[PDB]
Amino acid sequence: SRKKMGLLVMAYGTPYKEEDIERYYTHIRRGRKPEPEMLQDLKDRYEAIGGISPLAQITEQQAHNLEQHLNEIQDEITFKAYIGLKHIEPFIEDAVAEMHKDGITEAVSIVLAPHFSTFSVQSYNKRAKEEAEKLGGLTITSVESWYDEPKFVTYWVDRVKETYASMPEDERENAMLIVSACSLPEKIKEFGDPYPDQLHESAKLIAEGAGVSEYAVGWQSEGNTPDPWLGPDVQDLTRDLFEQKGYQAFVYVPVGFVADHLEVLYDNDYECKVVTDDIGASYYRPEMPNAKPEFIDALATVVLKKLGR
């Protein structure tokens, strides 16, 4: 009695083992293979954050718990998850072709990044649909943004509340909340990309929910191209904020990310930590959503809402 639907879960992608780093970054660098020194630096970074293998496992866990959870909370549809990545197989095109081969005719997609952007989400979505259209007999409704889903906001609000609650009294009264997302070229402003505004909206929502009056918006993990990227970078923001008001503790909420990947374990837990340690403030960075039940339910709701259910 259930209708069969494909669940297309897309993400940036992560290497599966150390030997994948080269091709992973070459693909990210659009064909430019990292020099030996960079390659070694990269390996060291991954090793320092606890190894690579756990990383890719997270996306897989998220896709499968989501699939099982959606299949459990409603009884009209039976979902089958398919992972489509941007920088490593299984690629988006691959995930779609396989859905087509398994007989899927109807699908719903969602990108494992809460804020819409012309650079990523729109691109992932456009590519998934074009492949489908190329194969035929398969349609896809795509979620474009979900940073505003209440369950998702509540997840970060409560993690923030716990973090501040755990702080000493003097730290609780002199802390700064830095909410961030992956940086992108400023040029996206040319198309009226709402990415920046959406991140600011995420920050306002989480801070308001958590009762935090002092907070700021920053960006991190930008790439390296001649064209200016969205700023300020979380590193400069932290030091700048400290130099002007002397906060004793910084709370980092990389709302743009959904799992324990390199951008959070290193770019936050290491790079921002270097700065807070340097200035003498306390470093705090709440648990990322990953595959926790609360997160999965929020995503399930996002998908069901998209389908009018």
- Listed in sequence order, the residues at least 6 apart from 251 whose beta carbon sits closer than 8 Å to its beta carbon are 160, 163, 164, 175, 176, 177, 178, 284, 285, 286
List the determination method: X-ray
Q: What is the largest CA-CA distance in the chain?
A: 63
* Owner of token pair 């492949």: 131
Give CATH for domain 2-146+289-309: 3.40.50.1400
* 251: alpha, beta or left? (left if phi > 0; alpha if psi -120 to 50): beta
Buried/exposed 120-151: b ≥16 CB within 10 Å, e otherwise: bbbebbebbbebbeeeeebebbbbebbbebeb
* Owner of token pair 């992932």: 124
CA distance 150 to 94: 32
CA distance 158 to 171: 18
Would you kindly state where each structural domain of the chain is located, as residue ranges?
Answer: 2-146+289-309, 147-288
CA distance 102 to 114: 28
- 78 CB-contact burial (10 Å; exposed 0-12 / middle 13-18 / buried 19+): middle
Buried/exposed 83-113: b ≥16 CB within 10 Å, e otherwise: bbbbbbeebbbebbbebbeeebeebbbbbbb
CA distance 206 to 209: 5
Q: What architecture does CATH give domain 147-288? A: 3-Layer(aba) Sandwich (3.40)
User: Would you say 183 and 229 are in contact if contact means Cβ atoms under 8 Å apart?
Assistant: yes
Give strand pairing partners of 182: 220
Question: For residue 300, which of 74, 56, 59 has the smallest C-alpha distance?
Answer: 74
- 264 CB-contact burial (10 Å; exposed 0-12 / middle 13-18 / buried 19+): buried
Query: How big is the CA angle at 116 (ends 221 and 147), to the nearest 5 degrees?
Result: 90
* Lateral strand order in the sheet of 3-11: 77-85, 3-11, 106-111, 139-142
- 183 CB-contact burial (10 Å; exposed 0-12 / middle 13-18 / buried 19+): buried
Please tell me what resolution, in angstroms, this structure has. 2.1
Cα dihedral 10, 15, 21, 23 sign: negative
CA 215 → CA 41, 48, 176, 251, 279, distances in Å?
33, 29, 5, 9, 18
Cα dihedral 189, 254, 125, 226 sign: positive
CA 292 → CA 10, 214, 216, 299, distances in Å?
18, 28, 27, 11
Give strand pairing partners of 181: 219
* Owner of token pair 């960079």: 38
How far the first Cα of the chain sits from its last, in Å, is 17
CA distance 170 to 185: 38
- Listed in sequence order, the residues at least 6 apart from 255 whose beta carbon sits closer than 8 Å to its beta carbon are 114, 147, 156, 179, 180, 181, 199, 202, 203, 206
CA distance 182 to 267: 10
2-146+289-309 and 147-288, same CATH topology: yes
Q: Which two tokens stand for residue 45?
A: 């970074």
